[PDB]
Amino acid sequence: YELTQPPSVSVSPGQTARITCSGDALAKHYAYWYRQKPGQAPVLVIYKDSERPSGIPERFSGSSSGTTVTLTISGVQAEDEADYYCQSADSIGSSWVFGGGTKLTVLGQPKAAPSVTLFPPSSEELQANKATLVCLISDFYPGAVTVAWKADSSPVKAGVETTTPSKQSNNKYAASSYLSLTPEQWKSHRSYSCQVTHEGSTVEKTVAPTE
Amino acid sequence: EVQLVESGGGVVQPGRSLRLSCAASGFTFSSYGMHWVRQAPGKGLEWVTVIWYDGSNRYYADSVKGRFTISRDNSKNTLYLQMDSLRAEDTAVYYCARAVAGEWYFDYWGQGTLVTVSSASTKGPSVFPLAPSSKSTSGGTAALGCLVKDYFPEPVTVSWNSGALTSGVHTFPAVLQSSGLYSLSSVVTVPSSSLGTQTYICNVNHKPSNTKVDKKVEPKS
Amino acid sequence: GTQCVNLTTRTQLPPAYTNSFTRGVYYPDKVFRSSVLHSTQDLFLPFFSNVTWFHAIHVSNGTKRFDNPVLPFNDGVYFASTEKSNIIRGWIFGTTLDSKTQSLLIVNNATNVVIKVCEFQFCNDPFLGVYYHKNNKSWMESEFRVYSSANNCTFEYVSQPFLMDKNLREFVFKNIDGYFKIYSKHTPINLVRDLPQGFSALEPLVDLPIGINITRFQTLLALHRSYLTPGDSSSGWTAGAAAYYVGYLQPRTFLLKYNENGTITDAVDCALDPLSETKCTAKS
Ligand SMILES: *[C@@H]1O[C@H](CO[C@@H]2O[C@@H](C)[C@@H](O)[C@@H](O)[C@@H]2O)[C@@H](O[C@@H]2O[C@H](CO)[C@@H](O[C@@H]3O[C@H](CO[C@H]4O[C@H](CO)[C@@H](O)[C@H](O)[C@@H]4O)[C@@H](O)[C@H](O)[C@@H]3O)[C@H](O)[C@H]2NC(C)=O)[C@H](O)[C@H]1NC(C)=O
Ligand SMILES: *[C@@H]1O[C@H](CO[C@@H]2O[C@@H](C)[C@@H](O)[C@@H](O)[C@@H]2O)[C@@H](O[C@@H]2O[C@H](CO)[C@@H](O[C@@H]3O[C@H](CO)[C@@H](O)[C@H](O)[C@@H]3O)[C@H](O)[C@H]2NC(C)=O)[C@H](O)[C@H]1NC(C)=O
Ligand SMILES: *[C@@H]1O[C@H](CO[C@@H]2O[C@@H](C)[C@@H](O)[C@@H](O)[C@@H]2O)[C@@H](O[C@@H]2O[C@H](CO)[C@@H](O[C@@H]3O[C@H](CO)[C@@H](O)[C@H](O)[C@@H]3O)[C@H](O)[C@H]2NC(C)=O)[C@H](O)[C@H]1NC(C)=O
Ligand SMILES: *[C@@H]1O[C@H](CO[C@@H]2O[C@@H](C)[C@@H](O)[C@@H](O)[C@@H]2O)[C@@H](O)[C@H](O)[C@H]1NC(C)=O
Ligand SMILES: *[C@@H]1O[C@H](CO[C@@H]2O[C@@H](C)[C@@H](O)[C@@H](O)[C@@H]2O)[C@@H](O)[C@H](O)[C@H]1NC(C)=O
Ligand SMILES: *[C@@H]1O[C@H](CO)[C@@H](O)[C@H](O)[C@H]1NC(C)=O
Ligand SMILES: *[C@@H]1O[C@H](CO)[C@@H](O)[C@H](O)[C@H]1NC(C)=O
Ligand SMILES: OC[C@@H](O)[C@H](O)[C@@H](O)CO
């Protein structure tokens, strides 16, 4: 028993988003749909394929067809950007199952290029026989970036730890990347660079032990 | 009216045990079957377990079968989940939920409790100053900060100048490193002209290790 | 085997009492007789005999109650039900009804009857599951939840269904000299609570060469998925049709009236009363 739904659906404001859920069990029993926004418990949106709870606006309609159920959201607005889960239960009532979830993205937000700040290791950390380079990346949209570190001109292979991008208060995204080195490594290269690629544009900052 | 409140979540090493509680109010607890559902960070919803109104029957997801026990005390309107032999893959927000009477879905949800399974041991951070740099800031300003490295578990709090300095502050989400430890950075953008006259100190607080650090961030020489 | 479900509630359902009137008669044998009155001593349901009416499940508030008891077999059983819902699917017969002894399982479903004799480890609350398939828009079998395990099987028989599709079903069960004998009749009626007046003899259904002790039995029921939610309420089922009648056979002498077509149309329980004793002494 397992329910397969696409991981992402993108729609423009005012258009109709359609999120599908498929699985053999769906031909036998009712499906149920839930909306979850970041940091919140899920909320029932559709039950028994098509019925709406009192609090659910008419823009949400459910349909079914063989092994697939569909949540249709007409008049999509910014507030509808969220994760939507389909759910079922087996024949004998011994098992409940969730789909993998679908991220609904509401389009229309312009691209935003990242600001990048790169800090060298502090003298105090070098006195502790460690060395961390800090690459802070902020105010970018879409929330997807690639980070590459370079020692002189050669890409480093290791010591890199990078966050997944997170939504800022202003609905742009932030991320950070850290490169861990020994003091000897830091001081034995001419420079190190943090290279951030976003939407086909690359920002590269470079720091050197000299300073 | 109806309320479900989870408790008992926290940070525990793999192989150890933990007992979650959910305190129900606003409805006839004993008339409703209760569920636990979980959600690993960044991942989706996974049904964990259900208990019937009277405890007569219990069902567990295969991933937790043999490890977790659901139970309830109707006189206390409290639902429990005993998690034994915890594994890293049990890391998740655990939600309490009510089984709708007469159907197969969940009509009410708790606010959730976070369970973190990790072999890392509690460790307070090293805090390093990030000396001021005007290279990436607007004209007449400079960015300075604090690196809060290799701490566990989350969270740390960071203020600047004991909270007097809020404008231009950006505290970044932590990285969870392969070592199992977290690091984060906090940077504030301030006027460049102030650097010789305004002292800047970041106040780092890590309650899990009872560690506080007040770091003075001086310009480079 | 399968997993087992705990259905019996703390609150039980009360049995009711009624009479057999003149029911439970059956063709003791396969011998043709015509336009004749025949005296025979056998295990019959005495007339006006003590009969118990059980409600196995009920939905009130919509509260759930379940009480589907294991009953004695004694010398034989008269079983009857009124249901157009195909809820009653069969029976379990045996002694310990666990893996220590053999037991007889009789199960019906849409396509066939299966009869097995095994060392069964029976669930405390055995039953069959059924659910409403929403696309085919019809009822279908879900999962058996009758026994945990079964070994040492010595008898298996498969044939056509007889419990499937205002309809009174009557059965008589006997367990004599190694044979489990089943007689049955289907009659249309317009009565609800009590067994109807009138006469209808039960026709031989099957003699099974089983060869086991039987001292107890339990009815097998088909439950809707609607009833298995984890709450105490069942909004999706008018379960009141899940009831049955049980009486017990006794060694008695009966006179059977066979009409010119060989059908039994009337009978006399010779021990009932002096008038019947007279009709049996007189043999007319
Ligand atoms: C005992 O059985 C006989 C024979 O019936 C067969 O056997 C029984 C066991 C069942 O299996 C039946 O389905 C079998 O058919 C019954 O016979 C009755 O016969 C009378 C006439 O003697 C019928 O009443 C008449 O029927 C006329 C219709 O034509 C029929 O009869 C003619 C005779 O010439 C025959 O040629 C034709 O083929 C038909 O068979 C009709 O016009 C007339 O007005 C009158 O109604 C009666 O209908 C028959 N019974 C049945 C059930 O059909 C006995 O009735 C039965 N006795 C008992 C007590 O059940
Ligand atoms: C159906 O009910 C049986 C019987 O359980 C009894 O009735 C319930 C209503 C509750 O009141 C139970 O507390 C009570 O025992 C269930 O079987 C029983 O399950 C429990 C829990 O798994 C078993 O206890 C465990 O036993 C193992 C050793 O086998 C220990 O290691 C554990 O620490 C714990 O004590 C119990 O043994 C078991 N009893 C039997 C006879 O099997 C059954 O699970 C339930 N069906 C369900 C849950 O759907
Ligand atoms: C009515 O019930 C029969 C019998 O069901 C069987 O006996 C019962 C007493 C329970 O023990 C059931 O759990 C058990 O299945 C159903 O017929 C059975 O269907 C199953 C599933 O198709 C058959 O199993 C298969 O057998 C083939 C043999 O070639 C294997 O290759 C398969 O891997 C699988 O094991 C089973 O043989 C079959 N038995 C009979 C006697 O027909 C029947 O389907 C059911 N009616 C409905 C409408 O569901
Ligand atoms: C037989 O019937 C019994 C009921 O007995 C009758 O009612 C009670 C209240 C007394 O008035 C008594 O004198 C009556 O004869 C049931 O209790 C019993 O379970 C029945 N037994 C069987 C095997 O059906
Ligand atoms: C299966 O049966 C084996 C033999 O039991 C004997 O023969 C059967 C046919 C019955 O007549 C029984 O009463 C006899 O004792 C057992 O040795 C074996 O343990 C049985 N299997 C299990 C799992 O119990
Ligand atoms: C549903 O109906 C179709 C058409 O009759 C049939 O082929 C299919 O097998 C049915 N599904 C099930 C599970 O019986
Ligand atoms: C039937 O029961 C009798 C006791 O009443 C016992 O002696 C006999 O062995 C039983 N038959 C079987 C097959 O176990
Ligand atoms: O055992 C008697 C046979 O069943 C028939 O002779 C009857 O007439 C019933 O059909």
Q: Is residue A2 part of a domain?
A: no
Polymer length of chain C: 284
- β-partners of residue B108 are B98
Q: What do you get for the CA distance between the two ends of chain A, in Å?
A: 61
Supply φ then ψ for residue C233, to 5 degrees. -115, 145
Residues 6 or more apart whose CB falls under 8 angstroms from that of B26 comprise B1, B2, B3
Nearest CA to ligand 1 atom 17: C261
Residue that terminates a domain, selected from A52, A79, A106: A106
For residue C110 and ligand 3, the question of a CB distance below 6 A is answered with: yes
Whether residue A37 contacts residue A106, with contact meaning beta carbons closer than 8 Å, is answered with no
Residue position matching structure tokens 């389009």: A107
In this structure, the number of other CB atoms found within 10 A of the CB of residue C5 comes to: 21
Residues A102, A31 share a domain: yes
Domain count, chain A: 2
Query: String of b and e for B48-77 (b: at least 16 CB within 10 Å)?
Result: bbbbbbbbebbbbbeebeeebbbebeeeeb
This structure was determined by X-ray
Same domain, A84 and A35: yes
Closest to A95 measured CA to CA, from A176, A29, A6, A162: A29
- Residue showing tokens 């009966």: C254
Task: Specify whether A47 is located in the same domain as A79.
Answer: yes
Q: Domain for residue A171, yes or no?
A: yes
One domain, residues A101 and A13: yes
Give chain B's length.
221
Cis peptide before B153 (omega within 30 of 0): yes
What CATH code is carried by the domain that includes residue A162? 2.60.40.10
For an interface test with B, the pick among A125, A130, A134, A140 (most B C-beta atoms closer than 10 Å) comes out as A134
Closest ligand to Cα C69: 4
Quick one: A72 exposed, middle or buried, by C-beta within 10 A (0-12, 13-18, 19+)?
middle
Give the domains, in start order, of chain B with CATH numbers: 3-117 (2.60.40.10), 126-217 (2.60.40.10)
Distance C34 CA to ligand 1 centre (A): 17
Q: Which among B9, B186, B185, B181 has a CA at the least distance from the CA of B110?
A: B9
Mutate to test the pocket of ligand 3, among C114, C148, C155 (most ligand atoms within 8 A of CB): C114
Q: Tell me how far apart the terminal alpha carbons of chain C are, to the nearest angstrom.
A: 56
Which residues span the domain enclosing A15? 8-106
Of A98, A117, A128, the CB nearest to B187: A117
Residues A48 and A72 in one domain: yes
Q: Do A92 and C134 touch (CB under 8 A)?
A: no
Are residues A150 and A63 part of one domain? no
State how far the Cα of C94 lies from the Cα of B98, in Å rounded to an integer. 41
Q: Which of A106, A123, A153 is the last residue of a domain?
A: A106
Q: For A107, left (φ over 0), alpha (ψ -120 to 50), or beta?
A: beta
User: How far from C158 is each of A114, C97, C118, C127, C153, CA to CA, in Å?
Assistant: 74, 22, 15, 19, 14
Stated length of chain A: 211
Name which of B102, B80, B82 is nearest B90 in CA terms: B82
- Final residue before a domain boundary, out of A83, A106, A129: A106
- What pairing do the DSSP bridges indicate for beta strands A68-73 and A60-65? antiparallel
CA-CA distance, B157 to B169, in Å (whole number)?
A: 13
Dihedral of the alpha carbons of B204, B206, B212, B216, in degrees to the nearest 10: -20
Q: Does residue C259's CB lie within 6 angstroms of at least one atom of ligand 1?
A: yes
Q: What are phi and psi of A25, to 5 degrees?
A: -55, -25
Query: Are A15 and A60 contained in the same domain?
Result: yes
User: Which one of C66, C131, C232 makes the best mutation probe of the B interface by having the most chain B beta carbons within 10 Å?
Assistant: C232
Establish if A1 belongs to a structural domain. no
- Same domain flag for A65 and A128: no
Within 13 Å and on the Cβ side, how many CA atoms surround B169? Answer: 18
Angle at alpha carbon of residue C64, lines to C59 and C66, rounded to 5°: 100
| CB-based pocket (< 6 A), ligand 5 | C 119, 151-152
Place of tokens 């606003």: B26
A136 → closest Cβ in B37, B95, B187: B187
Tell the burial category of A44 from Cβ atoms under 10 Å away from its Cβ (0-12, 13-18, 19+): buried
Residue C238's closest CA among C125, C108, C84? C84
Angle at B212 between CA B210 and CA B218, to 5 degrees: 160
**Phi/psi of residue C241, nearest 5 degrees:** -75, -5
- Are residues A79 and A141 both part of a single domain? no
Q: How many angstroms away from the CA of A68 is the closest CA of chain C?
A: 11
Contact C220, C126 (CB under 8 A): yes
